[PDB]
Design a protein around this ligand. Structure first.
Ligand SMILES: CC(C)=CCC/C(C)=C/COP(=O)(O)OP(=O)(O)O
Ligand SMILES: [Mg+2]
Ligand SMILES: [Mg+2]
Ligand SMILES: [Mg+2]
Ligand SMILES: [Mg+2]
Ligand SMILES: [Mg+2]
Lengths: 338, 315
């Protein structure tokens, strides 16, 4: 993203914290409002903010140029921060569920002194807070109700994704019979692609007064295809990228690598996965990495990266109902880095 | 609640489960049906039935159609979905329930609202009420947690002002305000002054409800764990107001400890400090104040609704 777009977006965050903690609403409980400021300051504004900024980009590529006022671009930024509020809520909870040590370079929120399982309340609180932001800045606009309904629906779908991911684990141990490409695809769609890709684009559309369910559906078909590649590349680089140190094997994740390894494995190779996948010992991670190398997963990913890129590019050329192709090409180029 | 009211309310629940669960992801949808079935419809449903009663006592008789009473029942089930999300979060904090099931069950009430209410004039006030009540409930949960540090109760925090705030935010908003404000909105009663007048009485009733509960935790016939858990209970707050330095040291030493003998030491102190007699004086004085405020209720609100709520809490 541009320096001007990044700085404009970052300037909004302190106002959202004031709106949620210092707007003279709850003056009888200052210790709680001061704490919630710290919850927001720790968990919301330190990332790359890809999803927030992408909300602004989407809006700027969907709206008529003559409607792109500083005021409307700031509303897009506020919607972006609501996506970053939802994400913060989801990751606070996922870290507690996964018992992770760090997120985005920082100790996980639940590990901070006197949090622990109180992170569940903080998760609910941060997600609830975005609706207060929506009421303040959007209650007077026609997009208000569609935007509220989109956030609640995406929250419900993301929960289905997280729960489906959990149905791949039994008492801390991966259930390898569950590691199918069909279930993988479903996990990625529900758990990540709705909030990562569909939510920013649909928000841009609503702010631009695009309400045609068919325009949203066309955008969704493409964004779910891009989202699937984004998570597959992420899974690949967890094991094969250059040092973030990847822990997906130890964690027993239903990764694209594990799914494709099980498709390709002879019985001896399947037994290695059963014995060593999702185990804590370093030598068990190395055994799984070595099996991924033996099964040719690097070549497999290289072929998938080229084929998927060509299929998505073809599908974007075929988009209709006046959706701008350049937006979908721009999202592709960010994800494929070409 | 009449047999007819209870039975009509219960008949809605299977529809709500089908609405939310019945797809490319049938194994996780089936699981979510079980999450709902196992956690939402069991036990008394006082908050959801209160929403129906509020609507029936607020609406014009001519508008009380079977169809509108069913809409009130659906709003009551939305309150019960929020209750279930809060009981799940409590079960998770105590401990096939998954940690995200509390978030998922809470999110599901907004899908029910969209389904049944999105075309009605009351829709935005209702969704905004749920949004605000959720935020306030979370603030109250956080304030309760600020009364504990490193596993020990912070007795300097145990003030009546903080106790009243905890009860208001954590409990009374969603238990008492939300059912009545829903009944009002469904009956096209939008006037902020009417909601405010109801709120004054409902927060007083909610305060007595929690104080009675706190009293019975220690003094009721069973099994109460407030003392062992170091809870910011009315008994602990008043004990600290009434204690001399020797009595305060007994609280510092024994409040919030795991040993059964420490719970008996604290119960003995509550007896020594006359907490039972203090509760008797409060129950009589609060009953009189609340009855007075109900008789004074204005802005065209019905007395009988608030008397009914008061009578269920005080018996
Ligand atoms: C309803 C909830 C709480 C959803 C969580 C959403 C999410 C993006 C989880 C992280 O995935 P992960 O655990 O597979 O990977 P990591 O934690 O390593 O990012
Ligand atoms: Mg996870
Ligand atoms: Mg995780
Ligand atoms: Mg990853
Ligand atoms: Mg990780
Ligand atoms: Mg109790």
């Amino acid at each position: 993203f541009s320096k001007e777009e990044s700085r404009e977006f970052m300037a909004i965050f302190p106002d959202i914290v004031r709106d949620l903690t210092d707007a003279g609403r709850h003056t009888d409980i200052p210790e709680v409002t001061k704490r919630f400021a710290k919850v927001l300051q720790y968990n919301v504004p330190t990332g790359k903010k890809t999803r927030g900024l992408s909300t602004v980009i989407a809006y700027k590529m969907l709206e008529k140029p003559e409607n792109l006022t500083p005021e409307n671009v700031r509303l897009a930024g506020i919607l972006g921060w609501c996506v970053e509020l939802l994400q913060a809520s989801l990751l606070i909870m996922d870290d507690l569920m996964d018992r992770s040590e760090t997120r985005r370079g920082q100790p996980c929120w639940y590990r901070q002194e006197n949090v622990g399982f109180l992170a569940i309340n903080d998760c609910l609180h941060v997600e609830s807070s975005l609706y207060s932001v929506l009421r303040k800045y959007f209650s007077h606009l026609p997009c208000y109700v569609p935007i509220i309904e989109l956030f609640h629906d995406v929250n419900f779908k993301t929960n289905m994704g997280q729960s489906l991911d959990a149905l791949c684990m039994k008492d801390g141990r991966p259930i390898l019979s569950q590691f199918t490409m069909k279930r993988y695809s479903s996990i990625v769609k529900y758990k990540t692609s709705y909030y990562t890709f569909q939510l920013p684009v649909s928000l841009g559309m609503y702010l631009a007064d695009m309400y045609d369910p068919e325009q949203h559906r066309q955008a969704k078909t493409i964004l779910m295809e891009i989202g699937e590649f984004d998570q597959i590349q992420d899974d690949f680089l967890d094991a094969f990228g250059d040092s973030k140190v990847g822990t997906d094997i130890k964690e027993g994740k239903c990764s694209w690598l594990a799914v494709v390894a099980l498709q390709r494995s002879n019985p001896a190779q399947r037994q290695i996965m059963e014995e060593h996948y999702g185990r804590p010992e370093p030598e068990s991670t190395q055994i799984i990495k070595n099996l991924y190398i033996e099964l040719g997963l690097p070549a497999t990913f290289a072929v998938y990266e080229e084929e998927s890129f060509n299929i998505i590019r073809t599908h974007i050329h075929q988009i209709s109902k006046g959706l701008p192709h350049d937006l979908f090409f721009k999202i592709m180029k960010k994800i494929y880095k070409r």
